[PDB]
Design a protein around this ligand. Structure first.
Ligand SMILES: *[C@@H]1O[C@H](CO)[C@@H](O[C@@H]2O[C@H](CO)[C@@H](O[C@@H]3O[C@H](CO[C@H]4O[C@H](CO)[C@@H](O)[C@H](O)[C@@H]4O)[C@@H](O)[C@H](O[C@H]4O[C@H](CO)[C@@H](O)[C@H](O)[C@@H]4O)[C@@H]3O)[C@H](O)[C@H]2NC(C)=O)[C@H](O)[C@H]1NC(C)=O
Ligand SMILES: *[C@@H]1O[C@H](CO)[C@@H](O[C@@H]2O[C@H](CO)[C@@H](O[C@@H]3O[C@H](CO)[C@@H](O)[C@H](O[C@H]4O[C@H](CO)[C@@H](O)[C@H](O)[C@@H]4O)[C@@H]3O)[C@H](O)[C@H]2NC(C)=O)[C@H](O)[C@H]1NC(C)=O
Ligand SMILES: *[C@@H]1O[C@H](CO)[C@@H](O[C@@H]2O[C@H](CO)[C@@H](O[C@@H]3O[C@H](CO[C@H]4O[C@H](CO)[C@@H](O)[C@H](O)[C@@H]4O)[C@@H](O)[C@H](O)[C@@H]3O)[C@H](O)[C@H]2NC(C)=O)[C@H](O)[C@H]1NC(C)=O
Ligand SMILES: *[C@@H]1O[C@H](CO[C@@H]2O[C@@H](C)[C@@H](O)[C@@H](O)[C@@H]2O)[C@@H](O[C@@H]2O[C@H](CO)[C@@H](O[C@@H]3O[C@H](CO)[C@@H](O)[C@H](O)[C@@H]3O)[C@H](O)[C@H]2NC(C)=O)[C@H](O)[C@H]1NC(C)=O
Ligand SMILES: *[C@@H]1O[C@H](CO)[C@@H](O[C@@H]2O[C@H](CO)[C@@H](O[C@@H]3O[C@H](CO)[C@@H](O)[C@H](O)[C@@H]3O)[C@H](O)[C@H]2NC(C)=O)[C@H](O)[C@H]1NC(C)=O
Ligand SMILES: *[C@@H]1O[C@H](CO)[C@@H](O[C@@H]2O[C@H](CO)[C@@H](O[C@@H]3O[C@H](CO)[C@@H](O)[C@H](O)[C@@H]3O)[C@H](O)[C@H]2NC(C)=O)[C@H](O)[C@H]1NC(C)=O
Ligand SMILES: *[C@@H]1O[C@H](CO)[C@@H](O[C@@H]2O[C@H](CO)[C@@H](O[C@@H]3O[C@H](CO)[C@@H](O)[C@H](O)[C@@H]3O)[C@H](O)[C@H]2NC(C)=O)[C@H](O)[C@H]1NC(C)=O
Ligand SMILES: *[C@@H]1O[C@H](CO)[C@@H](O[C@@H]2O[C@H](CO)[C@@H](O)[C@H](O)[C@H]2NC(C)=O)[C@H](O)[C@H]1NC(C)=O
Ligand SMILES: *[C@@H]1O[C@H](CO)[C@@H](O[C@@H]2O[C@H](CO)[C@@H](O)[C@H](O)[C@H]2NC(C)=O)[C@H](O)[C@H]1NC(C)=O
Ligand SMILES: *[C@@H]1O[C@H](CO)[C@@H](O[C@@H]2O[C@H](CO)[C@@H](O)[C@H](O)[C@H]2NC(C)=O)[C@H](O)[C@H]1NC(C)=O
Ligand SMILES: *[C@@H]1O[C@H](CO)[C@@H](O[C@@H]2O[C@H](CO)[C@@H](O)[C@H](O)[C@H]2NC(C)=O)[C@H](O)[C@H]1NC(C)=O
Ligand SMILES: *[C@@H]1O[C@H](CO)[C@@H](O)[C@H](O)[C@H]1NC(C)=O
Ligand SMILES: *[C@@H]1O[C@H](CO)[C@@H](O)[C@H](O)[C@H]1NC(C)=O
Ligand SMILES: *[C@@H]1O[C@H](CO)[C@@H](O)[C@H](O)[C@H]1NC(C)=O
Ligand SMILES: *[C@@H]1O[C@H](CO)[C@@H](O)[C@H](O)[C@H]1NC(C)=O
Ligand SMILES: *[C@@H]1O[C@H](CO)[C@@H](O)[C@H](O)[C@H]1NC(C)=O
Ligand SMILES: *[C@@H]1O[C@H](CO)[C@@H](O)[C@H](O)[C@H]1NC(C)=O
Lengths: 259, 389, 380, 97, 49
């Protein structure tokens, strides 16, 4: 479905502090009120290889890290170095290496569905690490992955960008109140990681950790929006936190505000 | 003024600026160190023709502990220098460690005779990678002789340079110079493969405050006075910019704290003088400057007056009131009066008068005077034609 | 400092151009002296500092809202305080400065010289002018201030606009009430609205924006590899570093010249406005003007000055006719074959009888030989 | 000193500098001429209203009540001798409307 | 448009010069507005035809 965002996709364009300033920036941003694709995080496995057109806005309402990690590259077949963000409870395993990719790389666990237990039929998430050039492992932290159905409080908004051989990951954890499609709200994304990989990313792919007779499809989804070079007017409050933004080419009123 | 006689008035002169007292450089501590210790302390290197290759990247290629150490015997950089190694950045460095007969060290030289050179490891004419070569006689010498380092490199099939003599009897402690085994490690680095990620260690200096200094924070160079700031940066933010897009706050990399940056005090210098034949005495005004900073750059003073327009030197502060003679600013004027000296005062707007106003009282003149006054008005200025060509 | 902040090489390169800095500094100094002269000419028009008497028995007229208030630390009137509060700066203090002028402009060799006359002295001038007016009419502008009752002064003004003084002396209470109500309305309007001081606010905003643009121009490459002189010097060697620094020098010199030219034109505009303000002060506050629409709409009676940040405010008091009748009128009158013309007035008739009345206020009177003069005969 | 092909760079630098100097001079002269034209218009108005007649405008034709003005030529300007009437000795009484 | 009429490369090069174009546009707009202001001041003096 062609869902429409409202004001999401705003991230701090740099590491400069500004107080009560209406700064204007010309940078890769997600246009306001643009269609973003909505997928089913599930016989029916939604896990295609989507293009990486100079940036991606990845959002999801999953819990307990249903979507483990991502794949970035141009070939994604170990012939050229590919960047891997496979991540689970412990921590990320950021690994830019020519890792062999199976055509069906998902854990595939039917856990706590019919007889309340965690089982593992296959472990084909990793095929082989034929060669590598650089790897990095972060500290074994522990996010709030505990089972709490309740109402979703994890909108894992992410922005992936790669410019000048630098791969920048912006992200922010925004708790939400409505389990329906993306609720309206404003929240800027802080810088999370910067990597001097200098690799070359034309396609990307997500990684999932989840026979077909009477299968109860899981409840989860992820949105994939695309960045574009645009001019924005960012409002910094007295504390240096971006409180509001204006898209300088959305409509004539926004253009006047920017001017 | 390009004149030997200066008319009465106040004249601009050379600007005054507080020169920085010292230079302060701050950088994050050097934690990511390359595994040079492991590379040069390995128990045993690989074969000459099967030299091991270890990729070193994302670290600081510090050489203080390497060069200052006396353990090494021979070390020459044919493309770089240790002095400029510290302030040079590289993309990736590969360490190639192998043990060779002391004689083969000569063959290691680039473009040198001997087919063993290109059979094991050829050095091209443009190899800037540094080479470490240090004696390891005891380590690589066996009681009966280490025959593993065989030197039969005369294979019938020819091996081209960078395609990808059995004169040794035994490595023994009694072997003479040129025959003892030598540990050779090669620091071979490449460029134009990824953003630079290896760089030499960067020194840091102590932190100073409330002094005009030349600060260098993470490559941000500026001059100013660093002060403790009550601002609150976000964890990821480093700098602080004002509305005019100028740096005004900075976060110290070593200690996470916010320091305000204030430009070093500066301002024009004006000389208040009466006419040259009235007197040769003068006073100096430092426009928009504290009177406590002036002697930094008449230093003694003995007559200082902190006015809203700046510190005034050489003028006595009198606290009567007269008509303005030489304007200074903020209602302060200077004049030459009785011995004679320059006096600074708050100018009087005029004699105070209280009209005897009433109900039913009127004032009527009795005897006029005829007054003639002169008014001058420019009407034109000299014509001027300029031949552009 | 602005072009080559802390760079010996850049300073040496600028020495090639040479005297441009001297020219720009001369222009700016001339502008500053012109500003001081403008303020002096506008306000310093009293040879003595007159002060109102302790007893404010001005024939029933109220001037409390415009006279100084000794209680406040700044001896400004109520309306002066209102104007000062209404006008607000944009960047920072020029002012209430107690230290360095406190602007980012300081970072790049930009300074603001304080005005020669402080707001206290400007308020003193305004108070002197107003007291002289309300206590001596227009005489203080021509010579020694001669006191006169305010009712008599207003009668003189009424005679000036062509209305007989008996009108004032018989409607004094009504006129005083109307003046007080108008002053109160002025105060309320100034307190409520915010666009009244658009001219002064625009002047301040223009100055602030010009300085902000001048400072922002330091971040442009102008074709150089970088906008940071230290970065250029560190990253390049003498020759190409000099080339890039020359590019930056040219760009910043052009920016400075543009700013100075804009300032010169703006100073010309402000000088024209200040000359107009000085003329208005002299011709309205210090006297009564017959020029139409000069000292406000209607027949001018008197004006009161009130200082405002970087400008002046005139409270023009004017007389406006209110309720008109028609009457039938004739140019002259025939009595005994002789034509009688009004001395000062016009002949009118309510429908049955003829009277002669002044031309600005219906005061019918019997046509007598005193009100008219004879000239010629009837048939002409 | 230099050959045609390389002297052009130096000639271009000199031309740019001197052209900028000329432009600055002409702009300054234009502004100064505007100021002088304003002053000349004021002088013409003063002549017409003070010499050719008696002015009721206050402080226009000198301080005090204007009587008459006399013009005098001066280098690149004019000088007005404003003759004015100034009451001097005030003897003051009790008044009634 | 005047300097770099329909040329992306020239426009990008011109962007390096700062706010010169903005200043010129502001000056011309101010002149244009004050023309109408002058006409209004000279003529529209009576608000009753
Ligand atoms: C235009 O203006 C003229 C004014 O002359 C009007 O003419 C009339 O004039 C007489 C006085 O000359 C006015 O009425 C007179 O009143 C006397 C007593 O009445 C009192 O109340 C009236 C109210 O207005 C007062 O004006 C007046 O002074 C008194 O206080 C009477 O005694 C008068 O008698 C008349 O005749 C005798 C004998 O001839 C004379 O001796 C008197 O002087 C007087 O002329 C007289 O009645 C009268 O009010 C006036 N008329 C009006 C409408 O006001 C014109 O009438 C007027 N025309 C129009 C269209 O408005
Ligand atoms: C000539 O013009 C003047 C000014 O317009 C005019 O003076 C006043 O006109 C009003 C209305 O005709 C007269 O009536 C009074 O007005 C005042 C307010 O101005 C009121 O306070 C008076 O009190 C009554 O009305 C009030 C209404 O608010 C009530 O609150 C109060 O309780 C009373 O009922 C009354 O209305 C006013 O007297 C004159 N004042 C003067 C002349 O001083 C004048 O009438 C016009 N005509 C002439 C001079 O012929
Ligand atoms: C002349 O004009 C002045 C301004 O209109 C008058 O001064 C004050 O103006 C305000 C607003 O119109 C009046 O309304 C309020 O009054 C209360 C309390 O009354 C005060 O004033 C009365 C006299 O009017 C006085 O007797 C009391 O003791 C109070 O001092 C105030 O709290 C408000 O702030 C506001 O002022 C005032 O009443 C009025 N008077 C004073 C003293 O402020 C002034 O009255 C007019 N008359 C004269 C001779 O100047
Ligand atoms: C007006 O004449 C007065 C003096 O004469 C008196 O006041 C006139 C207004 C008329 O009403 C005359 O009939 C009457 O006799 C002069 O003004 C007065 O002068 C002094 C200041 O010079 C005022 O204060 C006095 O100052 C002297 C000198 O210091 C003291 O010794 C006194 O004790 C007193 O404080 C005085 O109040 C003032 N008014 C009166 C009634 O005296 C004035 O010079 C003259 N001319 C004008 C234009 O007003
Ligand atoms: C961010 O901006 C806000 C305002 O825009 C700043 O105001 C401060 O916000 C905090 C919120 O916690 C206030 O906390 C106070 O806590 C005490 C108890 O400790 C409580 O009793 C008060 O009622 C209040 O909630 C704080 O008072 C408030 N004011 C100030 C001067 O701080 C906030 O400081 C800014 N944060 C940063 C890091 O700049
Ligand atoms: C680089 O390492 C140095 C270590 O000195 C850091 O400088 C700071 O200096 C203090 C010494 O006083 C270090 O110990 C500290 O002592 C104070 C006082 O007892 C104590 O309150 C602190 O908790 C701390 O133990 C301090 O560790 C050190 N600060 C940091 C962040 O390391 C310097 O800041 C470091 N710079 C980096 C890591 O970028
Ligand atoms: C009205 O005011 C004028 C002043 O502007 C008076 O002018 C008078 O001019 C004559 C001639 O110069 C003066 O006479 C002189 O008197 C001195 C006194 O010592 C004497 O020494 C001289 O030889 C000569 O005679 C006269 O003083 C002067 N009067 C005044 C008051 O200054 C004019 O007299 C005044 N007339 C009236 C009625 O006030
Ligand atoms: C979740 O990720 C962590 C690391 O982020 C995993 O830890 C692994 O530890 C071994 C060495 O002990 C490394 O070789 C691996 O690269 C790490 N990553 C993976 C995917 O194994 C951890 O095993 C992962 N899963 C769990 C249950 O801990
Ligand atoms: C690894 O090699 C280094 C030699 O550089 C040893 O560390 C020290 O290096 C400095 C050079 O500045 C010498 O002054 C010290 O004597 C060295 N320490 C020693 C010999 O103990 C380091 O010890 C070696 N590690 C090993 C052999 O395990
Ligand atoms: C101003 O005019 C006169 C002069 O003061 C005043 O008339 C008398 O003045 C004395 C003292 O000021 C009072 O005690 C009397 O009451 C006044 N006589 C009266 C009212 O008849 C007058 O009060 C003041 N105001 C005016 C005349 O309107
Ligand atoms: C020049 O420096 C002195 C420092 O003493 C300023 O005087 C005050 O100093 C105290 C601290 O001892 C501060 O708390 C005050 O804020 C200072 N007053 C200020 C900043 O106005 C002195 O004022 C300074 N003078 C100028 C012209 O800057
Ligand atoms: C996305 O496309 C669908 C169908 O054309 C439409 O409903 C929707 O308006 C589009 N989203 C936006 C932001 O225009
Ligand atoms: C019973 O156990 C596992 C969970 O451990 C579950 O995935 C499975 O679906 C259940 N059995 C069947 C036939 O589904
Ligand atoms: C990198 O990957 C493949 C793995 O088989 C192989 O070419 C070799 O191990 C490596 N080649 C390089 C770094 O050129
Ligand atoms: C993309 O990958 C690498 C650099 O990261 C580059 O060498 C390669 O040529 C690129 N391939 C393209 C642009 O087709
Ligand atoms: C210089 O000489 C003149 C003539 O004596 C004298 O009036 C004056 O005191 C002196 N002027 C100055 C400005 O010193
Ligand atoms: C004017 O008043 C004071 C009072 O002591 C006097 O000493 C001095 O001359 C003036 N004040 C100063 C700082 O000179």
């Amino acid at each position: 479905a062609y869902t429409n965002s409202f004001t999401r996709g705003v991230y701090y364009p740099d590491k400069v502090f500004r107080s009560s300033v209406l700064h204007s920036t010309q940078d890769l941003f997600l246009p306001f009120f643009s269609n973003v694709t909505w997928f089913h995080a599930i016989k029916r496995f939604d896990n295609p290889v989507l293009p990486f057109n100079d940036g991606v806005y990845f959002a999801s309402t999953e819990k307990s890290n249903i979507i483990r990690g991502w794949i970035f590259g141009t070939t994604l077949d170990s012939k050229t170095q590919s960047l891997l963000i496979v991540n689970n409870a412990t921590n990320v395993v950021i690994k830019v290496c020519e890792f062999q990719f199976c055509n069906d790389p998902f854990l595939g666990v039917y856990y706590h569905k019919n007889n309340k237990s965690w089982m593992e039929s296959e472990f084909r998430v990793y095929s082989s690490a034929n060669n590598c050039t650089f790897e990095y492992v972060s500290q074994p932290f522990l996010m709030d992955l505990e089972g709490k159905q309740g109402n979703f409080k994890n909108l894992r908004e992410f922005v992936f960008k790669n410019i000048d051989g630098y791969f920048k990951i912006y992200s922010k954890h925004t708790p939400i109140n409505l389990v329906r499609d993306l609720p309206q709200g404003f929240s800027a994304l802080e810088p999370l990681v910067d990597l001097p990989i200098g690799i070359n990313i034309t396609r990307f792919q997500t990684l999932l950790a989840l026979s077909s007779s009477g299968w109860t499809a899981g409840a989860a989804a992820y949105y994939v929006g695309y960045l574009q070079p645009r001019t924005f007017l960012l409002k910094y409050n007295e504390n240096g936190t971006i409180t509001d933004a204006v898209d300088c080419a959305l409509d004539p009123l926004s253009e006047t505000k920017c001017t | 003024l390009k004149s030997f006689t200066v008319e009465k008035g106040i004249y601009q002169t050379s600007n005054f600026r507080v020169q920085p007292t010292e230079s302060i450089v701050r950088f994050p501590n050097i934690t990511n160190l390359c595994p040079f210790g492991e590379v040069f302390n390995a128990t045993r290197f690989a074969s000459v023709y099967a030299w091991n290759r270890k990729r070193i990247s994302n670290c600081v290629a510090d050489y203080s502990v390497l060069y200052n150490s006396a353990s090494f015997s021979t070390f020459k950089c044919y493309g770089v220098s240790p002095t400029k190694l510290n302030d040079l950045c590289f993309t990736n460095v590969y360490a190639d460690s192998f043990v060779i007969r002391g004689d083969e060290v000569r063959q290691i030289a680039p473009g040198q005779t001997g087919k063993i050179a290109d059979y094991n490891y050829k050095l091209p004419d443009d190899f800037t990678g540094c080479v470490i070569a240090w004696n390891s006689n005891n380590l690589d010498s066996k009681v009966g002789g280490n025959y593993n380092y065989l030197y039969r490199l005369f294979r019938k099939s020819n091996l081209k340079p960078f395609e990808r003599p059995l004169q040794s009897y035994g490595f023994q402690p009694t072997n003479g110079v040129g025959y003892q085994p030598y540990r050779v490690v090669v620091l071979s680095f490449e460029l134009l493969h990824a953003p630079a990620t290896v760089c030499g260690p960067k020194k840091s200096t102590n932190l100073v405050k409330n002094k005009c200094v030349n600060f260098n924070f993470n490559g941000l160079t500026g001059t100013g006075v660093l002060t403790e700031s009550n601002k609150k940066f976000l964890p990821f933010q480093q700098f602080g910019r004002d509305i005019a897009d100028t740096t005004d706050a900075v976060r110290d990399p070593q200690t996470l704290e916010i320091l305000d940056i204030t430009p070093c005090s500066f301002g024009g210098v004006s000389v208040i003088t009466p006419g040259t034949n009235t007197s040769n005495q003068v006073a100096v005004l430092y426009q928009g400057v504290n009177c406590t900073e002036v002697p930094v750059a008449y230093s003694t003073g003995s007559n200082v007056f902190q006015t809203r327009a700046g510190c005034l030197i050489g003028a006595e502060h009198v606290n009567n009131s007269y008509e303005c003679d030489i304007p200074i600013g903020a209602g302060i004027c200077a004049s030459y009066q009785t011995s004679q000296s320059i006096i600074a005062y708050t100018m009087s707007l005029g004699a105070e008068n209280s009209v005897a106003y009433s109900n039913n009282s009127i004032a009527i003149p009795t005897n006029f005077t005829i007054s003639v006054t002169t008014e001058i008005l420019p009407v034109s200025m000299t014509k001027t034609s300029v031949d552009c060509t | 400092m602005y072009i080559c902040g802390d760079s010996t090489e850049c300073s040496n390169l600028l020495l090639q151009y040479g005297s441009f800095c001297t020219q720009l500094n001369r222009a700016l100094t001339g502008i500053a002296v012109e500003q001081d002269k403008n303020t002096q000419e506008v306000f310093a028009q009293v040879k003595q500092i007159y002060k109102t008497p302790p007893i404010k028995d001005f024939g029933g007229f109220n001037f409390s809202q415009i006279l100084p208030d000794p209680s406040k630390p700044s001896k400004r009137s109520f309306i002066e305080d209102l104007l000062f509060n209404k006008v607000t700066l944009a960047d920072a203090g020029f002012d209430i400065a107690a230290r360095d002028l406190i602007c980012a402009q300081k970072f790049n060799g930009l300074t603001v010289l304080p005005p020669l006359l402080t707001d206290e002295m400007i308020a003193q001038y305004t108070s002197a002018l107003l007291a002289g007016t309300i206590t001596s009419g227009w005489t203080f502008g021509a010579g020694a201030a001669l006191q006169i009752p305010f009712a008599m002064q207003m009668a003189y003004r009424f005679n000036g606009i062509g209305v007989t003084q008996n009108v004032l002396y018989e409607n004094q209470k009504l006129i005083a009430n109307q003046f007080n109500s108008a002053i109160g309305k002025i105060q309320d309007s100034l307190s409520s609205t915010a666009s009244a001081l658009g001219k002064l606010q625009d002047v301040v905003n223009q100055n602030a924006q010009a300085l902000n643009t001048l400072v922002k121009q330091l971040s442009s490459n102008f074709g150089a590899i970088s906008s940071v002189l230290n970065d250029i010097l560190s990253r390049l060697d003498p020759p190409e570093a000099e080339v890039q620094i020359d590019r930056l020098i040219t760009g910043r010199l052009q920016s400075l010249q543009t700013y100075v030219t804009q300032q010169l034109i703006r100073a010309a505009e402000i000088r024209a406005s200040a000359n107009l303000a000085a003329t208005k002060m002299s011709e309205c506050v210090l006297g009564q003007s017959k020029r139409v629409d000069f000292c406000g709409k209607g027949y001018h009676l008197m004006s009161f000055p009130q200082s405002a940040p970087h400008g002046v405010v005139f409270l023009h008091v004017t007389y406006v006719p209110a309720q008109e009748k028609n009457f039938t009128t004739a140019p002259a009158i025939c009595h005994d074959g002789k034509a009688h013309f009004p001395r000062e007035g016009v002949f009118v008739s309510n429908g049955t009888h003829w009277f002669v009345t002044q031309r600005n206020f219906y005061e019918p009177q019997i046509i007598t030989t005193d009100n008219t003069f004879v000239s010629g005969n009837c048939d002409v």
